[PDB]
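Aim 2, interim progress: modelling of the manganese (II) ion-bound target.
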Amino acid sequence: SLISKEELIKLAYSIRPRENEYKTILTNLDEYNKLTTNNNENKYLQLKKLNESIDVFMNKYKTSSRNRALSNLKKDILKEVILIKNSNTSPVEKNLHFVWIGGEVSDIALEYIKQWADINAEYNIKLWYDSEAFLVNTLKKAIVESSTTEALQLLEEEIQNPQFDNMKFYKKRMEFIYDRQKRFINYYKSQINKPTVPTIDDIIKSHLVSEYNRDETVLESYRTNSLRKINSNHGIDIRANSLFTEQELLNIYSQELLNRGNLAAASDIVRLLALKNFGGVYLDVDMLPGIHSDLFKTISRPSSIGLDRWEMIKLEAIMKYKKYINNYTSENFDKLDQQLKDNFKLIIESKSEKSEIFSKLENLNVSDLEIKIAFALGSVINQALISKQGSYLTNLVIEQVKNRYQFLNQHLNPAIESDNNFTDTTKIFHDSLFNSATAENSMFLTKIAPYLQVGFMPEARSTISLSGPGAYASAYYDFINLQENTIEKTLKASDLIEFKFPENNLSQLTEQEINSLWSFDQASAKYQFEKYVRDYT
Ligand SMILES: [Mn+2]
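Predicted structure of the complex, ligand included:
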């Protein structure tokens, strides 16, 4: 709660008459204080209105004796936001949302998912997929593999030279990739309006048969198998539901799914809509249930192994002696002391059910203002989220994503629509983009400039600032500071303890997580390239 209007009057009292902008503050404060309603949103909006009115005063009367008391008010307002979001608080909808789009869901992922279902029988499992787009990953691989071969043939004389700059390969390949995506897309555009009303998979299958020497029967049985496999396993179809309720988000989803072949970005969109509409918990398929706090509370962690690695080996232990998941790595566990390896066996064998090893979600109490998110390396990471349907912050994130894409597309579209190659298209995009640079948005611009090569070239990481963690971190900034449309600033893990995915409720250091956190950096690029050259021979 905030100081009364009367208290502010006393605190900010001065020899001067009350400025008009000061009277407004007093009114906004009083009206906040007199809020009878207990809906979190309406309190928030009034707090926001008060805060804005304070900035108006302070920016106009920069030397006012009142500024100290008003600066103190603004500090109290920051705390009031946290008090509100922590006020009314009840369990999220009992939905676990996963997403596997663009191909056949792996068995490996089904196993990880199975663990959650077993432990939380009262939770509905939603495995989102796109019934029309099972061939999207197949197409992306065809394009990349074809382009790799084209680039290696072109650069055949140079690639073996150990001093070869592998970037020359990646740039060259990107040109071939761009031309092939553009060929696909233009063909898609010619088909999609016919009275036959073809699907994405119809169009991809035909293109693959025509241009990539594929067999229709093989493609078709992969498609029908992917469909039944996913329907049999909590599968829920994006196309038959109410996820996409307006054209703008659909188009963002489609440009990622169809034009770029970026399934991670597509999934970034789907997870947010699933949360907005249904509420619940979202998880990547490499996340696992949290382990009971006191399970290995009696095993001292050696100084030689890190905090993270210790969390990994805990999972590996559970897995060597319960094999809940097939072929779970034992690398880190096999070592080193033969004592703890038995203390591990002792405690794990002393349990008989899975629910004794893993903790249940039960009620996750959140308010209708918030979204909770996992952390990694000091940043938020959207591989795990909790949110009530229609939550204020989840909408803030969606708005961030929409405005970032609106900006991206404003500059990108004219370049795409032009009939140009990769290099010329890039230039038209960059020349428009960087002419919009301000102090405020410069970094963001620099981050989205390599958008077209995301997934295909090293260090192209635009997704983060578009549909990924960067959009969430700016939305968190919006929310904490009662601002809107923040792009320059992000809030970090250390800023957001009040919004953390409760640690006890999640195990992030899983085997599939780690061998998935592969990033397209230089080092990884060097290795991929060396593999490419070794196979080519
Ligand atoms: Mn991962």
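The domain at 4-88 is CATH 1.20.58.1190 (Methane Monooxygenase Hydroxylase; Chain G, domain 1). The chain has three domains: 4-88, 89-290+360-537, 291-359.
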